[PDB]
Amino acid sequence: DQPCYLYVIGMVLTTPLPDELNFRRRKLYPPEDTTRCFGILTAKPIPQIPHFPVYTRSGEVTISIELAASGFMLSLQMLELITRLHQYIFSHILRLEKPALYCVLPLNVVSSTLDIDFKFMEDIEKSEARIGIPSTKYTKETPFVFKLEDYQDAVIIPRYRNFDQPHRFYVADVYTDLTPLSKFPSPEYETFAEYYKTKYNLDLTNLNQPLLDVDHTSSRLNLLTPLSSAEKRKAKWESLQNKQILVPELCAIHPIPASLWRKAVCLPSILYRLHC
RNA sequence: GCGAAUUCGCUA
RNA sequence: GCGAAUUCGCUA
Numbered sequence: 184d185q186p187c188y189l190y191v192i193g194m195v196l197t198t199p200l201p202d203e204l205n206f207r208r209r210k211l212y213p214p215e216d217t218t219r220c221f222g223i224l225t226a227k228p229i230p231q232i233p234h235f236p237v238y239t240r241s242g243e244v245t246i247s248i249e250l251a252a253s254g255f256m257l258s259l260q261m262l263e264l265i266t267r268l269h270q271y272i273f274s275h276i277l278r279l280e281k282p283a284l285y286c287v288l289p290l291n292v293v294s295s296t297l298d299i300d301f302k303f304m305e306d307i308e309k310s311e312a313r314i315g316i317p318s319t320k321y322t323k324e325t326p327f328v329f330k331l332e333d334y335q336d337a338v339i340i341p342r343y344r345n346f347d348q349p350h351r352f353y354v355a356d357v358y359t360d361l362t363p364l365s366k367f368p369s370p371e372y373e374t375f376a377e378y379y380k381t382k383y384n385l386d387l388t389n390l391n392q393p394l395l396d397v398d399h400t401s402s403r404l405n406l407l408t409p410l411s412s413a414e415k416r417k418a419k420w421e422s423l424q425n426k427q428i429l430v431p432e433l434c435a436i437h438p439i440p441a442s443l444w445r446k447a448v449c450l451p452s453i454l455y456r457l458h459c
Numbered sequence: 460g461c462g463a464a465u466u467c468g469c470u471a
Numbered sequence: 472g473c474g475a476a477u478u479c480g481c482u483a
Contacts, residue, residue, distance in 0.1 A: 344482080350460090368483070378483075401460075412476060420460060420482085427483045 184255050190223045191290055191297050192453060193247040194446060200242035207425065209355070209398060211241040217336075217442040218292040219300060221450065223376075224265060225285045231243055235456060237449045238409040241333055246453055251290070263300070268304050275314060276439060276447055283454035284404055289443065305421075310438035315349060316342050317435050326388035327432040331357065338400060338437040338444050341429065343383045351440050352429070356396035363387050363393065375430060377426060385433060392431050397422045402448040407456065 186192055194214035205211075214220070223229070235249045257265070258411040269286040273279050291300035311317035319342065321327045335355055340349040365377040375394065379385040439447070 237480065341482090350482080372483095375483085399460090411474095417460065424460090429483080 184256050185226055187252075187257055188225045188228055189252040189255075189299070190225070190229055191251045191266050192221045192287075192450075193245075193249050194220060194449070195245045195247075196239075196242055197236075197245045200240070200241040204398070207240075207379075207398070209240055212442065212445055213241065214244060214446055215448050217440075218297075218305065219440070219443050220290050220297070221287050221443075221446055222290040222297070222299070223248070223285070224257075224288055224299075228253075229457065232457065235407075236405040237452050239406060239445070239449060243409075244449065246449070246456075257414065264301070264304055264308075265299070268307065271307065272447060272450065276349070276444065277451065279404070279451060282451060283458045284451050285396065287450060287454075288325075294313075294399040307438050311341070312435045312437055316340060316346060319435075321388040321432065323388060327392065329389060329392040329431055333436060334395065334431065336440045338439060339395070339397070339429065339431075339434040340439050342435050343379075343385060343432055350424075351400045351437060351444075352397035352424075352427075353400055353444070354395050355398040355425075357393050358396060358428070359393045360429070361394040362392060363390055363394070363432075373429070379430065379433060381441060387430065387432055389432055395429045395431060395434070397425065397427055397429055400448075402442060404451050406449060427436065 194212070195214035196215065199211050199213075229248060231324050232248055234245050236243045237246055238244075265286050265288050268288060272287055273282045289300040289303050289429060290297045305425050307313060319327075337354045338351050339354055340351055363379075367373060367375055367378050369378075372381060376387055376390065379387070401421070439442075
């Protein structure tokens with residue numbers, strides 16, 4: 184077997200988005216606030232490259248590619264696991280056929296010290312929300328239980344539509360003053376519970392849970408720099424998507440945390456820069 | 460983003 | 472095929 188090189192893709196939010204530019208009124212998420220990040224595993228050294236910006240939703244992020252380890256070996260089993268996850272990142276999370284517009288892999292702390300997050304990779308592979316919508320069995324006697332902690336750093340998908348390609352959302356807010364019995368913003372339905380019952384024939388087992396504000400996960404491919412009728416229509420679609428209020432019981436939590444998802448969307452730009 | 464309708468520009 | 476304008480449907 185040939186020896187490996189491991190690089191960390193360092194990310195720091197060096198210029199937070201100014202208020203005048205925060206049109207979608209998002210929270211800002213510095214990548215450096217969470218330890219799990221991405222790295223690159225290669226058989227060749229990567230030539231030294233200067234720091235460069237990607238322009239994300241939260242502002243300008245400085246990217247630095249730094250050597251974490253070299254000269255070590257990995258077993259075939261681990262290389263295959265890493266390979267599957269690289270493919271997973273581009274085919275299932277970003278849904279992209281051309282990663283650069285050798286293997287990206289997750290790194291995490293073992294104690295302020297970055298290494299390949301094998302456990303995280305294994306958890307992904309075991310997740311029932313790994314690809315699509317996981318089965319659930321909420322009944323009156325075994326109802327849905329809302330745990331706030333599970334929604335703090337979550338990406339969620341609706342369990343009740345778009346089965347072939349689910350819409351993924353960041354949880355942007357937890358509305359504790361709302362429940363499924365809150366008033367529905369349309370004269371056609373009295374409550375959120377009635378909407379989901381009438382539209383989808385969905386029953387709820389928990390009428391006390393808070394509701395959720397969401398932010399679509401969609402990102403443009405090239406973030407290396409900071410109009411039309413069609414772009415207008417798309418912008419209007421994204422606005423309505425972001426006005427949606429969802430019911431936790433009716434959604435599934437994706438195994439990839441929001442904090443890591445926010446970093447993943449930078450990957451195509453970074454690989455493009457490295458290759459071109 | 461996935462669709463529809465109507466109208467206009469680019470070829471000889 | 473490469474573009475543009477106007478209008479409508481799908482999410483809560």
